Design a protein around this ligand. Structure first.
Ligand SMILES: NC(=O)c1ccc[n+]([C@@H]2O[C@H](COP(=O)([O-])OP(=O)(O)OC[C@H]3O[C@@H](n4cnc5c(N)ncnc54)[C@H](O)[C@@H]3O)[C@@H](O)[C@H]2O)c1
Ligand SMILES: NC(=O)c1ccc[n+]([C@@H]2O[C@H](COP(=O)([O-])OP(=O)(O)OC[C@H]3O[C@@H](n4cnc5c(N)ncnc54)[C@H](O)[C@@H]3O)[C@@H](O)[C@H]2O)c1
Ligand SMILES: NC(=O)c1ccc[n+]([C@@H]2O[C@H](COP(=O)([O-])OP(=O)(O)OC[C@H]3O[C@@H](n4cnc5c(N)ncnc54)[C@H](O)[C@@H]3O)[C@@H](O)[C@H]2O)c1
Ligand SMILES: NC(=O)c1ccc[n+]([C@@H]2O[C@H](COP(=O)([O-])OP(=O)(O)OC[C@H]3O[C@@H](n4cnc5c(N)ncnc54)[C@H](O)[C@@H]3O)[C@@H](O)[C@H]2O)c1
Ligand SMILES: Oc1cc(Cn2cc(C3CC3)nn2)ccc1Oc1ccccc1Cl
Ligand SMILES: Oc1cc(Cn2cc(C3CC3)nn2)ccc1Oc1ccccc1Cl
Ligand SMILES: Oc1cc(Cn2cc(C3CC3)nn2)ccc1Oc1ccccc1Cl
Ligand SMILES: Oc1cc(Cn2cc(C3CC3)nn2)ccc1Oc1ccccc1Cl
Lengths: 268, 261, 264, 268
């Protein structure tokens, strides 16, 4: 018994083998899921990465800003999994924000063109993915997205914080639409994980006073967490996501599950 | 196969076969857990009820107000599950509030003696259960308790609402202590279920409209006669599959709390 | 003694005399504030409306989407209030969302161009107003914006709900920047008010079912809620403009008759 | 001129001149309120303290655990302010917790007798004060109580944290009852202030590996606060309470106002 025996799950957002999306996929496969992967921009490079997953799985190009890709997605998936099958799961593990909206760059200096692009990719896309894919989702199934607790402002995360606050609201509306199909929609609010986006968008959003000032702030998780937090281990987050994909949280929708070692429950 | 293969889990709070505790136990057993049950006052009557669970399991008396029962509990459990074993799970599904602190009885008329008793049984006991049982819990294991969303005031629930607000805080402190043992502590905030205590809150058709301030709001709906979804949600926290969630609250309420209408 | 004796406060967002902005301004003036008003697009029509306030006050064009207006705003205000003076208060009472992102139009059908425009006007603008104006704000002063509780999803409000969730986050970051100047930044989360924009959420054909949902305020509110009376909201905003909430920033104050504290 | 011209306001919880209650009273009087003070146990000593307020004001004995004092309070107040008058305001600035429920003493080791006492005094009393006083309150008036943000667990505050979580719920119920009279009920959630209860119940709830560990946690306010926090200045808190007593927050009940320099809105 896999936790996800014979479930068909789409997984977006793999780019390196540190990606949260990757570990979600590895764990979903270990628990008997047959996957359909999506990737953005660097398909050849993503394909080397996905070969390292425990099982082969079809790979589809999806740039959540591409009108045509979303219009096509529903059909490209049906053709990848077998005509007359549907998905039981969907994982949105996608984010972006320009350099201007992040790190040491003044919050007031981010121009709206740039903020808008981030909100498009990191928040609105959760709705446009749900729109494209609900028609090919079974009753019982689960949409899951990735969140970083935005309830309080923090240094550096800046306009991404705002995108996550938007995503949180988007998720509650998707839950309403998804409800008509017997589908749940939830976010996992993870603690920090060494992934590409952490480094090149955030660590590289500061340079010098930079990446050791990542470090201290992120022990505003390991310290607070009553069971601790390990930034190098995505397994706990991946498992938490699989739990939402499974049949074992069947009464939770529009909601947020914290995979953060409990840190958000503790002030110190 | 089972979500909880070979896990040893204590389950408090069974009294009838409608009890949320009962369905937790049934589902935990269906997923391969070996249980140890706790019950209060009416042990003879509880035992007829537990015979209807899929498997037999030892039953132990625990009145969370009884000094001696808590002091003894740790050892009475070790003897029930095998000397040299420990628990992997603990479920607190316990509540009480005098009639004065609930229903049509004015909120201002509940005397503190009565409120205090409710807080003792419904909130503090979560801490005293955790104290008694953490020394016999394995790393990885989960403590779970039952909550009803107290963030907003509502008619009838009155001083139980206040007990739940207290319980929510108690849970976050237990998580700190439980953390030293590698143990998670969480609450499930369930939607309404027809149980004995629900009867004990108070005509009972005015309950009904307020409780469709769940089925209505819930994007996937809510069925007050079906505890399965709640029981499954609890088992999820008992399992290895939410390993980075502690001090926290999980809403098994059909999503109702995320919707204003 | 006015609550706001000799305070200089900018007030955006007036368009009719039902506008929440209007009642904020009336109450600020009743309490001794000298105002500087902003309006968008229909300046001639806004000016008839502002003449009905207890005192006349200069009116400046501000379209929060206009690069040049924001760059210029700081100086156009300094010239309106006296060179070598500054503002003590700023009120953002601005919102917009295309028809597609709202009412009976499916949530999944709003194209991002349209959502983005709403977020620009309703959320980002709070930051760009703060950017333009903090250099000419005194220590002690208050920035205030208008919110509608987005914590929970609801029918109709749709993508405006998402804009408010964004605004709530934006406000906490503005508070950080405003802090360097000795300035507070807060939002008032008001209950519903019969204003122009409220009619703009459907029209009609759905818009009587607004009413039941809005008694998910008057019913819940332990002191009730009157959709025709903006006074309580205007006063709540003035409280934040005053010296009497000096240790509250990045935050949200509910002027909703207590409705958000009650499930029923 | 005064923010509270000719308002009649009861103020509980004065014991030293560092008491938050004291500064509430001083500020209420500076803004034209006529007060009625309550005090507990050490009435002679409280009376030296209240003589230092800008105006004299009658002092009444109130031990919120005393059946008879609450039953009598309503009438003892009517007699202090004039027959045929009523109160426009009530300030609950009261708390207590045994040593066992606090500081270095293990959370698990507090016996319920002791926790119960704390909950009685710190939370339930808000309801029993409201019960005693609403019959002699005018429409428009305000009940206000003092809170310390209990939404996340923290070191030391222990079972007082639980009392405040209870108080927050109690306040929402009081608001419903108070609503029938046209009365608001709110809490102010203050940042830390050097008061007696801080020191002898909390700083002295540790002694040796002790009251300097309070210190780090309390700069989990001045640091986070975008406009900073001064533990020696109760004025900002007292003013915030007066704001709720005034006519200027007339649409806010059942609620919580953070007078904490914004710290609770900031993760770092
Ligand atoms: N790493 C953390 O600490 C952390 C914690 C919580 C939440 N998150 C969130 O987790 C998610 C995944 O990020 P990650 O840290 O695993 O990093 P990452 O860089 O591994 O993954 C981000 C992904 O977004 C993709 N992407 C960007 N623009 C896209 C577009 N137009 N179309 C489709 N995909 C696009 C990238 O190709 C990449 O695969 C994001 O939503 C992020 O906000 C990250
Ligand atoms: N049914 C609902 O709608 C609902 C909703 C949310 C939460 N809950 C919670 O679920 C838990 C159980 O409620 P239920 O509805 O399943 O109830 P129930 O009435 O079927 O069972 C309640 C139990 O309370 C226990 N109990 C009371 N005082 C005790 C004491 N001193 N020591 C030990 N046991 C004692 C009994 O063993 C009894 O089985 C409670 O914490 C309650 O708040 C119930
Ligand atoms: N009315 C309510 O029930 C209610 C409740 C909560 C919050 N609010 C908020 O109050 C604020 C004002 O709304 P209202 O209900 O008084 O309505 P309204 O229609 O009276 O005012 C909206 C204002 O926004 C201005 N505006 C729109 N686009 C602009 C732009 N590009 N640049 C500058 N100004 C622009 C308009 O010119 C108008 O002055 C909004 O932020 C709204 O969300 C209203
Ligand atoms: N000091 C802080 O930093 C801080 C911050 C936020 C909230 N609080 C809360 O503010 C309130 C006031 O505390 P403070 O710091 O002014 O302290 P304090 O020691 O100055 O005042 C506490 C008061 O408790 C009263 N009290 C104790 N037992 C009582 C009883 N049985 N009946 C009546 N009164 C009783 C005493 O008379 C005393 O005046 C409390 O509710 C406290 O929890 C304290
Ligand atoms: O959303 C994320 C959260 C985190 C956790 N995090 C935040 C921070 C900043 C210093 C506060 N550091 N780590 C890491 C990467 C994240 O991924 C992204 C961030 C911005 C844009 C795109 C992505 Cl995928
Ligand atoms: O904690 C519960 C919550 C609910 C939910 N609920 C509340 C209500 C009334 C309308 C407020 N109806 N259902 C039912 C039973 C519950 O169990 C108890 C309630 C009071 C006292 C003891 C218990 Cl076990
Ligand atoms: O932000 C508002 C909230 C409200 C309250 N509200 C909610 C609703 C529908 C029931 C959900 N109607 N009114 C009215 C006008 C509001 O102002 C706007 C709404 C949408 C777009 C632009 C503005 Cl300014
Ligand atoms: O409730 C309080 C909160 C605060 C704020 N605080 C708590 C703490 C220590 C970190 C836990 N430091 N400041 C100070 C005094 C407080 O007053 C009491 C504490 C326990 C019992 C009675 C009172 Cl008045």
């Amino acid at each position: 018994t896999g936790l996800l025996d014979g479930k068909r799950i789409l997984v977006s957002g793999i780019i390196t083998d540190s990606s949260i999306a990757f570990h979600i996929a590895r764990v979903a496969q270990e628990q008997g899921a047959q996957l359909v992967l999506t990737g953005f921009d660097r398909l050849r490079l993503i394909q080397r990465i996905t070969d390292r997953l425990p099982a082969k799985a079809p790979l589809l190009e999806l740039d959540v800003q591409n009108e045509e890709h979303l219009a096509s997605l529903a059909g490209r998936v049906t053709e990848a999994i077998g005509a007359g099958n549907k998905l039981d799961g969907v994982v949105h593990s996608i984010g972006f924000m320009p350099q201007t909206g992040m790190g040491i760059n003044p919050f007031f200096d981010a121009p709206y063109a740039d903020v808008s692009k981030g909100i498009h990719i990191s928040a609105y896309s959760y709705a446009s993915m749900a729109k494209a894919l609900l028609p090919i989702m079974n009753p019982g199934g689960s949409i899951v997205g990735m969140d970083f607790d935005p309830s309080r402002a923090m240094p550096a995360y800046n306009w991404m914080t705002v995108a996550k606050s938007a995503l949180e609201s988007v998720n509650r509306f998707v839950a309403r639409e998804a409800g008509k199909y017997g589908v749940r929609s939830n976010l996992v609010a993870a603690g920090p994980i060494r992934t590409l986006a952490m480094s090149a968008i955030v660590g590289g959003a500061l340079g010098e006073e930079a990446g050791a000032q990542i470090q201290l702030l992120e022990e505003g998780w390991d310290q607070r967490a009553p069971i601790g937090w390990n930034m190098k281990d995505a397994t706990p987050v991946a498992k938490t996501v699989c739990a939402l994909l499974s049949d074992w949280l069947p009464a939770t929708t529009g909601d947020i599950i914290y995979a953060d070692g409990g840190a958000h429950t503790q002030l110190l």
